[PDB]
Each structure stands twice: as C-alpha cells, then as structure tokens.
Amino acid sequence: PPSIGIAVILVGTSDEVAIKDLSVVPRVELVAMNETDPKSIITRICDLMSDRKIQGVVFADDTDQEAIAQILDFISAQTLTPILGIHGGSSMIMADKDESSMFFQFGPSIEQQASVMLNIMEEYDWYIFSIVTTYFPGYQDFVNKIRSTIENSFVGWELEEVLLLDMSLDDGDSKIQNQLKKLQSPIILLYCTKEEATYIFEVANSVGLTGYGYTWIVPSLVAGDTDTVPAEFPTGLISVSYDEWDYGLPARVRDGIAIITTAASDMLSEHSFIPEPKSSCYNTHEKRIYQSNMLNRYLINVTFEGRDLSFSEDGYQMHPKLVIILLNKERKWERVGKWKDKSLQMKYYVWPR
C-alpha cells in the first residue's frame, strides 16, 4: 500500500519508546524540537517539509504557551498542511483560525467550556455571578455563549458585571485595579491566558477578591500544565481541564496518526488522489492555484477503534472527556468532577473549603 509521511513533533521531555505503541499506510517520524519561538517552529516544520514528503504534522508540547497554536495555524494555512495540536500550548484553544487552516486541536471549544462552567454553577446553585475577560481571542464567543444560555433558561441567573481588561498596555494608571474593584459577585468566570491570569489574580488579591466568599472559575488554558502552579493562583480556584490523566500522550499521538492516515485513505478511496505535499514554504505564493483545503472534509470525520475522533469545522474536538479540577490548600490540582456525553458528575454534594 502507498506510504504517507507523518511528522510527529515533540517539544520537551517525553518517552519516545512509550509513544511508539486502509488504502494508505503511515511512515511516522518522531522529531524532537527544543525551542518554541516563531522562527524555530517555522524553520523546523519547513525543513521537515523539504526533506520528506510530509502529508501532515502531529504536534505535542510541554509548555503553557497558547501562542504555539497561533504559530501552527499560520503555518497550516500558508502551506496547506494538516497540523494537529494534541498537547500543551499547541492544544490551547485558538478561536477564529484562518479560512485556509487545516489546524485541529485536542481540546474543548470556548462555548463547550462556558457551558460546563454553568453546569457546575447550577449543581451548587451559584446563580449570581460576573465575567472577566481580556482581549484574548474567544472572549466574545465566551461572553456570548454565557449570555445566550442564561437568556434562554427558566433559571434565576443574574450576571452582575462583564469586565474587559486591556493587557496590551501597562498598569501604571491602575486601570485593572479600578476595574476589578467594581466586582461584588460571589462567583467570577475568568477568560484569559495563564500569564494574564497570574497578573489578574495578583491585583484581585490586593483588592481582596480572591479569599473565601469569592470563587473563581477558569478554562483549560488558564490551568494549563497542572504541574505548573503560579504562586499568585488563589486556593480554591476551579478549572475545566482536558483529561491529561487518562488520555495520555502515547494514545494522543496514536490517534493523531490514525486521523491523518484515515483521512488520506478516505480521500484516495473517493477521488483517486490525495494532495501532493509541498516541498517548500518558500514557493507557497506561486504554487497555490494547485493547492486546496479538500482534505479537511475527511480530517474532520475520522472514527478509529470505535472512538469518534471527529472535529468541529472550527478545529476543536467534538466529544472530549473533561475533568473538573480544584486547586487545594497544598497548592496541587485535585480532580473533583467529570464531563461526559453532555453530563456532569461531581465528587461533592457540598462544595468544600
């Protein structure tokens, strides 16, 4: 059977031996990468693309750098190469990906996480709340999902404040502090990056909004790597993490290889061709009337070993198994819930201190 070249890019420390466990067959190449700046990522993927006929990329990293997703989307869109953000900063949710993107992520959408957050609140009857976001993309999608959910519900929801903080400017005028001081709600939903949340919490503490009587609920990208807990994160912080526990990295890489291979097999089986992988990033301008996004109809609908590995048109996982986590007094993230097939199951009936 024909062979499709698949590059598996691993950033940081990982067990390559553990990781190493249709019409078309994959020729997998595990690639190690030390740096995650734009030049390093662009250069690595472009060098690999010229050395081998690379049909698709499986990317995994150990960082909390949500910018990796953005760098990858840009590469994916410019070169018309499927790229899967399966772990780390590469799987940190990228709202409004390019039209020409073939970038897909293992993780929940902003809208699904916002939904899970409200499911947690309904459980403990936390109907009075406020929202805080930065300009980080997806903030509009977050506020909108909350608003539309709350609007179309026979529940006593009360959204007291919605704050938008400008993290692109310095805080010499203490605008954030003056904005945060307006918060009165016992529950605060925060949408921003992990680096942004460290600052926000430092300030919110100075104004005394982090203690008991103030509960902060945050998305997956804020908690990020559960083994990296910024000192400024408040005790009793609730987050909606993607299951780094049960859905381990060797399984993700396997699934990522299956998606690219199945998609390729499916397109070859239906059109008697698959797109010829570009040998250059440096020719993308002249050779684009000959390139398409066509493989996306297939990459979005892959089922493997009775597991629906399908993605949304927006490039996020369709049915993830989410974990509800709580930052305890020993400053470690503790599992306190599970999100299944649109069902929430918590550990506690009475939320503890």
Partner: protein
C-alpha cells in the same frame, strides 16, 4: 557614547529604505541624543507570508528593534503584526486601510498613520449635517469592512438617521432584489460601503432600476471611486480620497517623527528593558512593550506632513484629511476637503445625479 536604539521598517523599495534612513538621521539631528540615539534597520517585503515572518526575526528582531514601520508593497502587514505581536513590539502601519487591523485581539501592538476605511463615516456624518440629509439608506457588503462602516456610522447617528441598512453577499452580480427594497423607501440618500468590484455590481444594478438620476444622492468612500468602480459609477456621485493616503514617503517621515518623540519620552521613565535579540529561544514578551505602546498611543505630532498626528482608542489615525470628490461629466472633480474636523467647500459647484436635487 550614547545607547543605540533601533527602529525597524518593512518598506516597498530601496528608495523608501533610504528615505527611512534619512528620517532617522534627521530625528538624531533635531533631538538631544547624548543619552539615546536612533538607528534605522530595514528590509523590503518578502515574496510570501512565511518568508516575511522569518525576515522580521532574522533581520529586525535580531537588531532589538523597539518598533517596526510597515507599508503596503509594489501580501499584507499581518505576518509582521503577528511576529512583532508575539513580543509586544509595536507596529506602525503606514498605508493599510483595512478595519481588521483595528481589532486588539488579532492586532495587539498595532498603530497606523492612516485611518481605516470605516472612519469615512465621520465625513459622511458631517456631510449629512451640512446638506441636511436627515434620512439615509446604508448599503454595505456583508464582509468585515462593510460591517465596520455600518457600526461606525451607527455609533455617530446614535438628528440625522439611517432609515434602513441593507447588506449584500460580496461577489453577487445581480443586486436588483436589494436595490428594489431601497427604491420602495422614502429616503433618496444612498451611502455605499463595498470593494471596487462589488461597487461596480451596485452601480450597474442601480442604473438599470433608474436610481442613478435626479432625486437621488450617492455618498460613497474611496474604494467605490477607484479602478473599475469608476468605469460604471453614476455621474453626480460624491466619494472621498484620503489626502497623502498612498504617499509612503510622507508617512515614513511622519511615523519616524512620532516614534522618535515617543522613544525619547519613554527614556524619561525608569526600568526600561531592551527588546529580545532575535526570535530563537525567546518566548517571553518584551516587558516594556506595553508601556511603549501606551506612550505611542498618546503621542501628538501637530506639524506632520500628513497633518495633525494623534491616535484613537484602537491606535487608528485621528484628524485625517480627505478630498470630497464629485463625478461631473465622467471626471472626478474636487468639490471640497474634510480638514480633520471640518468641511471646507471650494468654489467648484456640486453637480448631483442629473442637476441640483
């Protein structure tokens, strides 16, 4: 010995590269440069976006640039905005008028010496108050740009009112169903926001439905009186042209003067850190990047070549000047100017679709 502070630029040609080098030299000449001294680092546009992003790293971020000037070539400023944005290095757009660059989520450290197309609503609104057009019809393309003009005009109106807003799919050739809706309405002042090729479709459909003659007013922007849009444009139309909008030489001159002033104001403060030296291995932002943005955002340069330079809440140029253009006997005739805040009519009489309303 002073501290050498680099300024970057992505310009059209070697002529423009030389103009930038001269503007930095003049900045060093006019300012007190015992403490800090500017150095021009520049390149021309690369053939594609990946190549451009790599050039920003290799050629400019490698030189610890404090800001990057960007023009449109002879391929957009986006890979530059993204690369510089990663580090929070400010980008100064010299000629891009697309409203998308006003979006802080996407274009994080971006300012421009030219306003977005959507800001033409500021001129239409002043034109509306002047000629007493209290009831208007707004026709916009259903793209970002079209919606940006509609939001901006709506903001100003909320006196004169937009009786209805009509949106069309970009690329539609038959707009007779859309224009039939507008014809039924009492209002006879039609404002258009469309690209060059989409405006052509409007004009052709409008003319067939006999809406380009006496009784109607057509108030349009720059894009809708350019290239092909002009071939089929009705006589009597009122459009706009941003004075010096395409003069890369004038915008380099003004952007350098603004940046030079802001650098010196920045070094009056304490704990000013240097930008990263190159991209490789550097994933943290420039800690002074956000402070430098705030200093730039609030910079005023009154004696600019392109007028009074000030930036708004999105870092878009304020006090921009426009030529009020009128199509008379198939010729664009300047009938007035929008000086930055006021309409000044010249001695050339306006000819409306047909005669004088």
């Amino acid at each position: 010995d002073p501290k050498i502070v680099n300024i970057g630029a992505v310009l059209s040609t070697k002529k423009h590269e030389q103009i930038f080098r001269e503007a930095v030299n003049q900045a060093n000449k006019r300012h007190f440069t015992r403490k800090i001294q500017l150095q021009a680092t520049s390149v021309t546009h690369r053939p594609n976006a990946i190549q451009m992003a790599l050039s920003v790293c290799e050629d400019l971020i490698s030189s610890q640039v404090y800001a990057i000037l960007v023009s449109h070539p002879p391929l957009t400023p986006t890979p530059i905005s993204y690369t510089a944005g990663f580090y929070r290095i400010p980008v100064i757009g010299l000629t891009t008028r697309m409203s998308i660059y006003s979006d802080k989520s996407i274009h994080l450290s971006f300012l421009r010496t030219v306003p977005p197309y959507s800001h033409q609503a500021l001129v239409w609104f002043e034109m509306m108050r002047l000629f007493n057009w209290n009831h208007v019809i707004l026709i916009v393309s259903d793209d970002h740009e079209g919606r940006a003009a509609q939001k901006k005009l709506e903001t100003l109106l909320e006196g004169p009112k937009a009786d209805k807003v009509l949106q069309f799919e970009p690329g539609t050739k038959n707009l007779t169903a859309l224009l039939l809706e507008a014809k039924e309405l009492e209002a006879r002042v039609i404002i258009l926001s469309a690209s060059e090729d989409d405006a052509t479709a409007v004009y052709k459909s409008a003319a067939m439905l006999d809406m380009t003659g006496a009784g109607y007013v057509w108030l349009v922007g720059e894009r809708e009186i350019s290239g092909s849009a002009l071939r089929y444009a009705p006589d009597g139309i009122i459009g706009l042209q941003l004075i010096n909008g395409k003069n890369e030489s004038a915008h380099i001159s003004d952007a350098v003067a603004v940046v030079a002033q802001a650098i010196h104001e920045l070094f009056e403060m304490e704990n000013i850190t240097d930008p990263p030296r190159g991209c490789v291995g550097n994933t943290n932002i420039w800690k002074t990047g956000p402070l430098f943005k705030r200093v730039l955002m609030s910079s005023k340069y009154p004696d600019g070549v392109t007028g009074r330079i000030e930036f708004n809440e999105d870092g878009d140029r304020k006090f921009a000047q426009y030529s009020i253009m009128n199509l008379q006997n198939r010729k664009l005739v300047q009938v007035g100017i929008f000086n930055g805040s006021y309409i000044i009519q010249n001695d050339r009489k306006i000819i409306w679709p047909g005669g004088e309303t």
